[PDB]
Amino acid sequence: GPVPFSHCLPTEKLQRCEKIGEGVFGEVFQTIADHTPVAIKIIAIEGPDLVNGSHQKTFEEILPEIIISKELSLLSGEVCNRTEGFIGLNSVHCVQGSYPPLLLKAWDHYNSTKGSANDRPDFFKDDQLFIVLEFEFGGIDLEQMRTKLSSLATAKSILHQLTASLAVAEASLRFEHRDLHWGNVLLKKTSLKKLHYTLNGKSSTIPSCGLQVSIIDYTLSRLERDGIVVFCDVSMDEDLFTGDGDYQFDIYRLMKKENNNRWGEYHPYSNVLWLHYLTDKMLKQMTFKTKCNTPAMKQIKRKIQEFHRTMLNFSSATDLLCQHSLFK
Numbered sequence: 001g002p003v004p005f006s007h008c009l010p011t012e013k014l015q016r017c018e019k020i021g022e023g024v025f026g027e028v029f030q031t032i033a034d035h036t037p038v039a040i041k042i043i044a045i046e047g048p049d050l051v052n053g054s055h056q057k058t059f060e061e062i063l064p065e066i067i068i069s070k071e072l073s074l075l076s077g078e079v080c081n082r083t084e085g086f087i088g089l090n091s092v093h094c095v096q097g098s099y100p101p102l103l104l105k106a107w108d109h110y111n112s113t114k115g116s117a118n119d120r121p122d123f124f125k126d127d128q129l130f131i132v133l134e135f136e137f138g139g140i141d142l143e144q145m146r147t148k149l150s151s152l153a154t155a156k157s158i159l160h161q162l163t164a165s166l167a168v169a170e171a172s173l174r175f176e177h178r179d180l181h182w183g184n185v186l187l188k189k190t191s192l193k194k195l196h197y198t199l200n201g202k203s204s205t206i207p208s209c210g211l212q213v214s215i216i217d218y219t220l221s222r223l224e225r226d227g228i229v230v231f232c233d234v235s236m237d238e239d240l241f242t243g244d245g246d247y248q249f250d251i252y253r254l255m256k257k258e259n260n261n262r263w264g265e266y267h268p269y270s271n272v273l274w275l276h277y278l279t280d281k282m283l284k285q286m287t288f289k290t291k292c293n294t295p296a297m298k299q300i301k302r303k304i305q306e307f308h309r310t311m312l313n314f315s316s317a318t319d320l321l322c323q324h325s326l327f328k
């Protein structure tokens with residue numbers, strides 16, 4: 001049976017909650033649990049009220065995100081296919097209750113500073129069910145870091161880390177992220193000079209440039225184990241394919257073109273498309289502390305541009321990692 005909100009969010013944890021983002025199907029808070037930062041995603045399920053312009057998901061419809069979050073969380077401790085490039089999942093609970101007023105206060109603060117596209121979640125009754133996912137805190141998203149990166153060399157590390165992480169997940173799980181916009185790439189400072197990954201038993205390293213990248217938020221993702229596919233079936237979703245104003249919204253249409261609107265199949269070219277979108281953001285929407293005015297830096301820029309114009313001729317993140325000249 002479900003637990004009360006207080007099981008997951010006792011007073012002190014609740015008091016430290018700050019809202020950090022949102023989607024149609026969730027609110028996300030950062031807080032501190034046992035002196036440790038965490039991110040908490042809270043999703044309303046099974047109720048009759050419209051929420052953020054949509055009917056609520058059923059428990060069965062949230063299960064794919066839970067399962068995929070659990071699988072990717074395991075990758076940091078695997079051996080043949082190992083990466084720390086996703087994020088840890090600490091716990092999942094089913095909670096029952098109306099929304100805590102301290103969370104509403106956090107929600108209000110975010111709406112007042114950043115502005116929200118969601119309904120204030122103050123209409124839920126005391127029988128309302130929610131899924132609460134607690135993640136390891138992964139740092140600051142790439143969008144918020146768009147003016148904060150040191151140079152194009154940092155952008156190259158980030159691209160290499162992302163590619164490697166996706167390759168490891170493709171190899172182990174036939175994984176596609178499918179929604180890898182720049183809010184779903186997190187950066188955290190590290191004193192490690194090199195990061196390690198293993199792809200089908202071969203270990204390699206990547207210079208960190210002082211940052212560990214984490215890929216997050218598996219709401220649209222797909223994977224499989226033992227021929228059992230877990231995915232988000234968007235084949236009847238109209239709106240996902242009619243966005244504009246950002247190349248992000250072209251990617252949804254390009255994925256659908258690639259897969260013929262069959263979301264259960266494995267099309268790792270979708271990972272390549274997202275990587276192309278991310279390279280585009282790096283070349284166009286980032287400001288760097290150090291400009292590309294030395295020969296060394298100018299060469300890195302040329303290499304990233306050459307990656308941008310050639311990567312769409314590759315079939316998967318694995319193909320990019322193993323064959324693209326950027327990573328040699």
Ligand SMILES: CC(C)[C@@H](CO)Nc1ccc2ncc(-c3cccc(N)c3)n2n1
Pocket residue numbers: 020021022028038039041069087135136137138139140141183184186216217218
């Ligand atoms: C609002 C979320 C989606 C995200 C937007 O940049 N911000 C953060 C920041 C730190 C952080 N650590 C873990 C997570 C997180 C949040 C939602 C889903 C997942 N898988 C991971 N997040 N999300």
